[PDB]
Design a binder for these strands. Sequence first.
DNA 1: CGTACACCTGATAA
DNA 2: TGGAGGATACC
DNA 3: GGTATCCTCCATTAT
DNA 4: CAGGTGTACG
Length: 300
Amino acid sequence: GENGKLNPWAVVGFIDAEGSFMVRVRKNSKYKTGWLVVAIFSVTVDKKDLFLLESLKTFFGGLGSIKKSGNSTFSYRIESSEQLTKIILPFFDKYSLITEKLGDYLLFKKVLELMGTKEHLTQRGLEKIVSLKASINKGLSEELQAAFPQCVPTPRPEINNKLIPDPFWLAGFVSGDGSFKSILKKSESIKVGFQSILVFQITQHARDVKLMESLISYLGCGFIEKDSRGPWLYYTVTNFSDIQGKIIPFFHQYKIIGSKYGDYMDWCKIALIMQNKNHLTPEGLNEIRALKGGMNKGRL
DNA sequence: CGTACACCTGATAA
DNA sequence: TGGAGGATACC
DNA sequence: GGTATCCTCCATTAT
DNA sequence: CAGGTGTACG
Ligand SMILES: [Mg+2]
Ligand SMILES: [Mg+2]
C-alpha cells in the first residue's frame, strides 16, 4: 500500500525528480559584505507522503528538518553549510544525479566550497557566489541583478551522455515524476461502451530529451511525445502487452516509493482484469471503475 | 470488436 | 519546484 | 556585533 | 501528474 524502504539509487532518482539545490543571497546590512549567503537541500511531498520524508531524513542520519510547506505539502530541508558538506556532497558525489539538475548540484557544490573557507564573508568570494547563483535554477532575482550588475554568470556545466546508473534510480525517478494511468474512453464499437486503457507515463522538461529518449531503449518499449502547450515531454507506454510483460514486472522488482506504490498495486489489479478479458463485461468494467476511483487522486 | 498511437484539457501540489 | 521574510541561536 | 540556522508562508510551472 | 478523444487498423 505504501512503501518507504530506500536504496541509494532510489534516493538519487527521487531527488532527480523532486529535489532542489538552492542558494539564497539575502540583503542584510548586519553582515560585513551587506549580504547573507545560504545553501539549501530541499525536497517537498504531499502530506500523504510524510512517511517518505521521515525515511529520507533517517537515510541522511537524522540531519535537517521537516516542516509544513503549503496547504497539503511538507518540506524536508538541510540548510547547515557544515552538514551539507559533511553528509550530502559525499553522497551525491558518489551516487550522481543524471538530469539537468546535476548542473545545479555542481554549482551548489562550488558555493559550499567557498562557504567552507568562509570566503562568502568577503567581497570577492561573494561576487563568485553571485556568479554561481546566476546559473542555478531560476537565476538572479531583480534585486540581485541590480546589486551585482557586472556579474558574468558562470557557464552551466556541460554534462553529456548521462546513462541510467541503476534500476533503482528509475524506481525513484518514477515515484516523483511518473504516473500509472487508468483511462476509460467512450467507444461506439466495444459491447460494454467504454474501452479500458492503461498508460504508463513519465513527464519531464524538454531540456532532458536525451534521457527521456534513452528510456525507450532502457525499458525496451514506449515512445516520446511533446506537450502542445510548452517545453515538456512524456515518455509513454500504452501497448498493453508491453505494460504486462515489461513495465509491470520491472516495478514489481524495483519498487515505487511513497503512496504511489499503492497506485501501482491497483494499476496491476486492473491489468489482471484486462488480462483475463473481464474488462469487456459490465461486471469487469465496474470493478475497474471502482479500482480507478480509489487510486491516484481518489486515494484516502 | 477492440486496441493503440497521436492528440487533447485540467488541476496543483511539487 | 524553487523561492521569500522575519526571528532567533550561536559565536 | 557578525554570523549561521530556524520557522512560516508563497507564485508558477513542470508535472 | 492525471484523466479524456479520434480514428486507422487487424
Ligand atoms: Mg521533477
Ligand atoms: Mg514531480
